[PDB]
Each structure stands twice: as structure tokens, then as C-alpha cells.
Amino acid sequence: VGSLNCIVAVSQNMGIGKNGDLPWPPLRNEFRYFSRMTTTSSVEGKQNLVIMGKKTWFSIPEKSRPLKGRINLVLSRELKEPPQGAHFLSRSLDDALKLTEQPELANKVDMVWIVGGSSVYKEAMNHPGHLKLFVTRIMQDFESDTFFPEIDLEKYKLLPEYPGVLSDVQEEKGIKYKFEVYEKND
Ligand SMILES: NC(=O)C1=CN([C@@H]2O[C@H](COP(=O)(O)OP(=O)(O)OC[C@H]3O[C@@H](n4cnc5c(N)ncnc54)[C@H](OP(=O)(O)O)[C@@H]3O)[C@@H](O)[C@H]2O)C=CC1
Numbered sequence: 001v002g003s004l005n006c007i008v009a010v011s012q013n014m015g016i017g018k019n020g021d022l023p024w025p026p027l028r029n030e031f032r033y034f035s036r037m038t039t040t041s042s043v044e045g046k047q048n049l050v051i052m053g054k055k056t057w058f059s060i061p062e063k064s065r066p067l068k069g070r071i072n073l074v075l076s077r078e079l080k081e082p083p084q085g086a087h088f089l090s091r092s093l094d095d096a097l098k099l100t101e102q103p104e105l106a107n108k109v110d111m112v113w114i115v116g117g118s119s120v121y122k123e124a125m126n127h128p129g130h131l132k133l134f135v136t137r138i139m140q141d142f143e144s145d146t147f148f149p150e151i152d153l154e155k156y157k158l159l160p161e162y163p164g165v166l167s168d169v170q171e172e173k174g175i176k177y178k179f180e181v182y183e184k185n186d
């Protein structure tokens with residue numbers, strides 16, 4: 001299995017969600033960024049795996065689930081089987097990551113992308129080892145009821161360039177945003 005990664009879009013006040021959806025109106029090219037990053041795999045005959053909590057799964061429009069071209073894993077201790085349209089179910093982050101090492105997945109999975117929500121981001125960001133964060137900074141405050149955990153910049157370096165990630169200010173629907181990639185190894 002390849003690299004471990006988180007991807008998120010976050011407002012200035014650290015918001016990632018409100019009432020089961022995003023705090024901001026749809027940013028179509030920001031969504032396309034999410035799909036390009038999470039779907040694109042450099043390794044032949046492999047796909048990337050997405051790991052998400054149960055509320056994040058149900059926050060994706062049903063017409064867009066499962067996230068196409070990716071293996072979709074949902075984290076839940078209450079569910080007894082994957083949701084309709086999902087591929088796998090795990091009861092912990094450690095279990096999910098171990099699953100990628102099993103024979104059914106060992107030679108199929110390239111990158112792993114954690115796509116939230118707040119509890120899984122926090123646990124992933126604090127788990128020793130090599131991890132990158134692909135963070136979209138939405139440069140406004142938005143009322144939110146779900147927040148991104150603290151990024152400890154003593155361990156996560158903001159990278160000064162990354163191939164394929166635009167460096168300049170983007171804007172859609174009157175909302176400016178910019179892309180960032182962080183990396184730790186501990
Ligand atoms: N802006 C962005 O980039 C993103 C925004 N969002 C937004 O955030 C909201 C959803 O996030 P959030 O509310 O944090 O919810 P989550 O997606 O984290 O879902 C929480 C549920 O997932 C299960 N769960 C979470 N972590 C684990 C774990 N490690 N092991 C086992 N089960 C786990 C639980 O289910 P159970 O009780 O069944 O055990 C828990 O009740 C929505 O508003 C969504 O739109 C989400 C992702 C990214």
C-alpha cells in the first residue's frame with residue numbers, strides 16, 4: 001500500500017460542516033480538486049482507498065456515492081455491514097489500515113485518503129509515521145457545527161511547492177480559497 005493522506009476543505013474559523021453538509025455553497029472546482037487528488041493513482045492496476053466516518057458517507061449526495069474509481073471504506077461501530085453502495089466497514093482506524101494489508105486489498109490499494117470527519121482526522125493526524133495533509137483554506141468565516149482539529153505545525157511542515165497543486169488564490173461564487181500541502185514524519 002502507498003502513502004497515507006488526509007484531505008479537507010476548512011474555513012478560517014476551522015469549520016468543515018454544518019447541518020450535515022458543507023458550511024459554504026458548492027465550489028465546483030474545489031470538488032473537482034478533491035476528486036482529482038483522491039482518485040489519481042500513479043501505480044498500475046491499483047486504486048486509491050478512501051476512509052470516512054459514517055456521517056461523512058451519508059453527507060455525500062447519493063448520486064455521487066460510492067466515490068467512483070476509489071475503494072470506499074466507512075468507519076462505524078453501530079453498523080453491521082457497509083452501507084448501501086459502500087465497499088468496506090471497519091470499527092476503528094487501526095482496523096481499517098490493517099485491512100489494507102490483507103490479501104483481498106494488499107495488491108489493490110495505492111494511496112489511502114482519510115476524508116473525515118473530525119474524530120478520524122484527529123486520530124490520523126496524531127498517529128506516528130509518514131502523513132500528508134491536503135488542506136484547502138477557504139478564506140472566509142462560515143457558521144459551522146463541525147470543526148477541523150488543530151494542525152501542529154511543530155510536526156507538519158507546509159510544503160513550498162507540490163506537483164499538480166496550484167499555488168495561487170482561487171475564487172468561486174465570490175469565495176477565495178487556496179491549496180496547501182503539509183507533511184510530517186515521526
Ligand atoms: N469540509 C470537509 O472537508 C469535510 C466536511 N465534512 C462535514 O463534516 C460533517 C460530518 O463529520 P462528522 O460530524 O465529524 O462525522 P463523521 O463523518 O466522523 O461520522 C461520525 C460517525 O462515524 C463513526 N466513526 C467516526 N470515527 C470512527 C472511528 N475512528 N471508528 C469507528 N467509527 C467511527 C461513528 O459512527 P457509529 O456511531 O456508527 O459508531 C460516528 O458516530 C458533515 O457536515 C460533512 O459535510 C466531513 C468531511 C470533510
Ligand SMILES: CCc1sc2nc(N)[nH]c(=O)c2c1Sc1ccc(C(=O)N[C@@H](CCC(=O)O)C(=O)O)cc1
Binds near residue numbers: 060
Ligand atoms: C468527503 C468529505 C470531504 S473531504 C474534502 N476535501 C476537500 N478538499 N473538499 C471537500 O469539499 C471535501 C469533502 S465534502 C465532499 C467532497 C466531495 C463530494 C463529492 O460528491 N465528490 C464526488 C463528485 C466530485 C465532483 O463534483 O466533481 C467525487 O469525488 O466523485 C461531496 C462532498
